[PDB]
Amino acid sequence: EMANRLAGLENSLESEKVSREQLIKQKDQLNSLLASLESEGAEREKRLRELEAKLDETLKNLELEKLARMELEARLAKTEKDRAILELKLAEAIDEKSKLE
Amino acid sequence: EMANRLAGLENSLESEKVSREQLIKQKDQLNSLLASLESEGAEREKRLRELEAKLDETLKNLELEKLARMELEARLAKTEKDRAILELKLAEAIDEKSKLE
């Protein structure tokens, strides 16, 4: 009776062994997965942080440049107008001269 | 022997089913972890993809506005120079009018 309980206990021990080995292999794979994903994530968060800074900077610059552009379109119109005004005044003068001939 | 060897193996089997409960538990925690990290990573990659698109756009824009601004700086200098030459010409003419009279 007892030599039997002996055989069955060993049997039960071996079945617990196969289970144990299955779970440990599964765990190893999860741990590797884990480490990997962590590393990957570290790299991407660093990369993301960099992208963010770059978009902020570029954004600033785009803004500064729009102001600058507008300021110049204005300055240019003012100058263009003055230039036109002078050509007209010039004509007027070369003519008052002409007529004084 | 036999009776002893028995209660013995029952002890062994005992601690081992306990260990197995534990591995199952650690495994479950790992798997949950894995799901979370993967979801988190999916999100971060989505956000990264978005930032990249935005950075490309803004970069284009920065470039175009920079060309526009340089074109204007040039245009403005040319105009200012012509205006200066015209003020001079003007003076010269209002003076030729003066002397003439």
Swiss-Prot record, chains A, B:
Q: Which top-level group of life is the source organism from?
A: Eukaryota
- Disulphide bonds annotated for this chain are none
Coiled-coil intervals, chain numbering: 1-101
Q: Where in the cell is it found?
A: Cytoplasm, Cytoskeleton
Q: Which family does it belong to?
A: Belongs to the cortexillin family.
* The protein's assembly and partners: Homodimer; parallel.
Q: What does this protein do?
A: Actin-bundling protein. When linked to F-actin the actin filaments form preferentially anti-parallel bundles that associate into meshworks. Plays a major role in cytokinesis. Negatively regulates cortical localization of rapgap1.
- What is this protein identified as? Cortexillin-1
Source species of the chain: Dictyostelium discoideum
Write the gene name: ctxA
